DNA sequence: CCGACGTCGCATCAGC
DNA sequence: GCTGATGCGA
DNA sequence: GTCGG
């Protein structure tokens, strides 16, 4: 809230800079900044000021005076009344749809959520399910049923096998109030970086989960992530909305690194791995390793905790509830 | 003043 | 049926 | 777009 307008305005910015211009690195900048100003504990009065921030520099600075001082930006008003930036700037909202296609179907001249629809022939099975379910997935989600979705998750692990563990990660660990979606770290014995044992670990939970309809549809799958869609059994009371779900299962040994990537925050990870190379490390949801003078890396380095990570790279652990950057 | 910018999974594609 | 990348996503 | 460095 605090500067809330300037963070939205950058994050306005960023996702056209993405989804328009197709510049990531600088929807990366933009992103960087508005977070940088999100921890910037005072109310910023002048570009000036911001600038000072590291991610800050002289063309955010001056469009940070110019809404300071005028309560909008002249560039974010050009972008807004542009079809083809409007139309492409939402098309990518549907999941499957990223610029590059969103384009595509601007220049084809479907932009609409009619559009698409009388347009699914052109459509993979990814980008159809996204749009059967736009309005679900534009909805957050309360904790409660958050809950509800982790007892029913935690619950069928338990019956395909004991020994797996699952962890709800995303903001749902970071004690957030609500939540995009829910994302489901999932571990087993039989597999670390030391072998695969057993094969379809990941499969058998993801049956179990959709032979008792919990998970109702299925954007991606693979042997280590799960990209889909469930739902909460309503009672009939108004069925709850489809949700989103992401499971990750990741090498029991590597746990640590994979609880700490599953976590987030997503632009808190980024410059956390930005910091690590700053140091010669190199971190994935895998392992932490050591970057040689040559670029390669090293062999993982032990570790028994998210902290143990942060102690590497010298910095202060920070609990998941602060770690939303 | 240029170049690099976190690091990966899954679906697919241009070259072999 | 590989490598290396694009595209989209976490 | 920013900063490295
Ligand atoms: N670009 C990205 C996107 C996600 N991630 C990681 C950290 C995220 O918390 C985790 C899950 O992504 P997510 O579900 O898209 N967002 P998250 O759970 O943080 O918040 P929500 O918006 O889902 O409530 O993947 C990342 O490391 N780099
Ligand atoms: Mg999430
Ligand atoms: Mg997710
Ligand atoms: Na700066
Ligand atoms: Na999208």
């Given at each position: 809230?605090?500067?809330?307008?300037?963070?939205?305005?950058?994050?306005?910015?960023?996702?056209?800079?993405?989804?328009?211009?197709?510049?990531?690195?600088?929807?990366?900048?933009?992103?960087?900044?508005?977070?940088?100003?999100?921890?910037?504990?005072?109310?910023?009065?002048?570009?000036?000021?911001?600038?000072?921030?590291?991610?800050?520099?002289?063309?955010?600075?001056?469009?940070?005076?110019?809404?300071?001082?005028?309560?909008?930006?002249?560039?974010?008003?050009?972008?807004?009344?542009?079809?083809?930036?409007?139309?492409?700037?939402?098309?990518?909202?549907?999941?499957?749809?990223?610029?590059?296609?969103?384009?595509?179907?601007?220049?084809?001249?479907?932009?609409?959520?009619?559009?698409?629809?009388?347009?699914?022939?052109?459509?993979?099975?990814?980008?159809?399910?996204?749009?059967?379910?736009?309005?679900?997935?534009?909805?957050?989600?309360?904790?409660?049923?958050?809950?509800?979705?982790?007892?029913?998750?935690?619950?069928?692990?338990?019956?395909?096998?004991?020994?797996?563990?699952?962890?709800?990660?995303?903001?749902?660990?970071?004690?957030?109030?609500?939540?995009?979606?829910?994302?489901?770290?999932?571990?087993?014995?039989?597999?670390?970086?030391?072998?695969?044992?057993?094969?379809?670990?990941?499969?058998?939970?993801?049956?179990?989960?959709?032979?008792?309809?919990?998970?109702?549809?299925?954007?991606?799958?693979?042997?280590?992530?799960?990209?889909?869609?469930?739902?909460?059994?309503?009672?009939?009371?108004?069925?709850?909305?489809?949700?989103?779900?992401?499971?990750?299962?990741?090498?029991?040994?590597?746990?640590?690194?994979?609880?700490?990537?599953?976590?987030?925050?997503?632009?808190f990870a980024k410059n956390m791995r930005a910091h690590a190379?700053?140091?010669?490390?190199?971190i994935?949801?895998?392992?932490?390793?050591?970057?040689?003078?040559?670029?390669?890396?090293?062999?993982?380095?032990?570790?028994?905790?998210?902290?143990?990570?942060?102690?590497?790279?010298?910095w202060?652990?920070?609990?998941?509830?602060?770690?939303?950057?």
């Open positions: 809230t605090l500067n809330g307008g300037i963070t939205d305005m950058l994050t306005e910015l960023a996702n056209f800079e993405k989804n328009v211009s197709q510049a990531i690195h600088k929807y990366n900048a933009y992103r960087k900044a508005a977070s940088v100003i999100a921890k910037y504990p005072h109310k910023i009065k002048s570009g000036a000021e911001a600038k000072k921030l590291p991610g800050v520099g002289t063309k955010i600075a001056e469009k940070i005076d110019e809404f300071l001082a005028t309560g909008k930006l002249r560039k974010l008003e050009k972008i807004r009344q542009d079809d083809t930036s409007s139309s492409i700037n939402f098309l990518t909202r549907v999941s499957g749809i990223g610029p590059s296609a969103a384009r595509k179907f601007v220049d084809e001249g479907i932009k609409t959520l009619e559009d698409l629809r009388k347009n699914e022939d052109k459509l993979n099975h990814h980008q159809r399910i996204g749009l059967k379910y736009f309005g679900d997935f534009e909805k957050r989600i309360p904790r409660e049923e958050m809950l509800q979705m982790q007892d029913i998750v935690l619950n069928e692990v338990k019956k395909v096998d004991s020994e797996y563990i699952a962890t709800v990660c995303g903001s749902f660990r970071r004690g957030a109030e609500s939540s995009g979606d829910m994302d489901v770290l999932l571990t087993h014995p039989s597999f670390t970086s030391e072998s695969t044992k057993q094969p379809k670990l990941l499969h058998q939970v993801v049956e179990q989960l959709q032979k008792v309809h919990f998970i109702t549809d299925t954007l991606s799958k693979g042997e280590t992530k799960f990209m889909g869609v469930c739902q909460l059994p309503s009672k009939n009371e108004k069925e709850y909305p489809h949700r989103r779900i992401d499971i990750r299962l990741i090498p029991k040994d590597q746990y640590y690194c994979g609880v700490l990537y599953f976590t987030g925050s997503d632009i190379l700053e140091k010669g490390f190199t994935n949801e895998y392992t932490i390793r050591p970057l040689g003078v040559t670029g390669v890396a090293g062999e993982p380095l032990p570790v028994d905790s998210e902290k143990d990570i942060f102690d590497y790279i010298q202060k652990y920070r609990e998941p509830k602060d770690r939303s950057e």
